[PDB]
Amino acid sequence: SASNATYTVDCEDYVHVVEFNPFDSGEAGSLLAYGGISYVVIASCRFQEEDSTVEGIEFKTLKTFHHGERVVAIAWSPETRCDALLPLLRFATAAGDKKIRIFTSDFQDKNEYKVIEGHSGYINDLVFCSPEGTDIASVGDDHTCRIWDLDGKQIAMFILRSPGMSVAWHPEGAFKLMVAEKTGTIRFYDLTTHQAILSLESVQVPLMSADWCVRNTLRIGAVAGNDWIIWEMPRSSYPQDNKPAHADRARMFRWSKCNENVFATTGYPGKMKSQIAIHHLAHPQPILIGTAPVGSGLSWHRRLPLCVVGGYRKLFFWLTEM
């Protein structure tokens, strides 16, 4: 049974990637960056569950950034804040031109961007690989993982054996970076000694996405082929749990930021509507199965049990009842 989106927000163009702000900005609302065909819109999302005063969802676009290229991945910066005294809006966006654009703003007039070049292959995923927000890691189809600072200089380059699909920073432990290669070999790289700490293996191929669990650092989740896969460390490289997620192909894996048992997997934009299957570790079947016409981009709300999938000119929010 298809679940209707709890909240649906109309947009100006197809959303290619939607990302909530996982860091505290100092404001009541949770920031949302959705990147479309030629733009990156920063918005603020206040929900009914967060505040009773809000009826439904209070969606307010704060700042629109002209990108010029299709945004394929967005990474929020730890320094992002909406403090009245000192506002800072920093985020890194990769595009379909193998380039990283760091947009630094103050929410008032000042708008600065920096093109970082170097990748010879399309960047699939990028994240800020620093607690202070100084470094940005980007993985791509050139079989390389490159660490870039704020000034656009490569600090380190890790040669992968497969196109890097998803890069993720360790929630608590410092200097640990997870790179998920497309052949299923997810590796952990030290950012101090620049050496591969460990290499996990997925039973199925291709590994399309991987995410850490903020609540439980040990639990690592990923989507290889049609089945979702969970690993738990320091135990084994073998999948602990492996159950079918989608019939066609599973594309994006995102852990819940409020619960260590809930995770969402999005189906691949293809013959079927891009379905979302919010699974639960205890329940064999997904707790919520919703359908989005064409959906790309998945992110979880920092405090609420809510996820977002960017559909065609729309934003679909699904609330998972805990």
Binding site: Y14, G270, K271, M272, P293, V294, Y312
Partner: protein
């Protein structure tokens, strides 16, 4: 390109269908028939998604007059059902104001009085 278009139709990705259809229009530079087919497909998908203005533009671009007229009828019917009559009013009529009048007239003289809102 048409093969991929049929794929994307069953695939249910309307936007991809539209852009690829535009690229295919370019390849069929001299073939009015193929141009008309693809433009008709574009109009259809736009109408299905609620993109009234884009649908109307695609309609005004179809080289074949018969296809254009049938598409016009379909658009009129759909807008009536969705109660988007304001846009219908805004859309000008290519000497087919009377045609629209006649379509609705026939619908009325053919439907039960206590059920439909065509008359209104």
């Amino acid at each position: 390109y048409n093969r991929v278009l049929r794929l994307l139709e069953d695939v249910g990705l309307p936007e991809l269908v539209i852009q690829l259809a535009t690229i295919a229009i370019g390849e069929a530079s001299d073939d009015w028939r193929s141009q008309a087919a693809l433009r008709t497909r574009i109009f259809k998908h736009h109408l299905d998604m609620g993109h009234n203005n884009q649908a109307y533009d695609a309609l005004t671009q179809i080289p074949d007059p018969s296809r254009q007229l049938d598409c016009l009828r379909q658009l009129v019917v759909v807008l009536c059902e969705r109660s988007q009559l304001q846009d219908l009013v805004e859309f000008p009529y290519v000497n087919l104001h009377n045609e629209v009048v006649g379509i609705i007239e026939s619908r009325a003289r053919a439907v039960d009085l206590m059920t439909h809102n065509y008359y209104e």
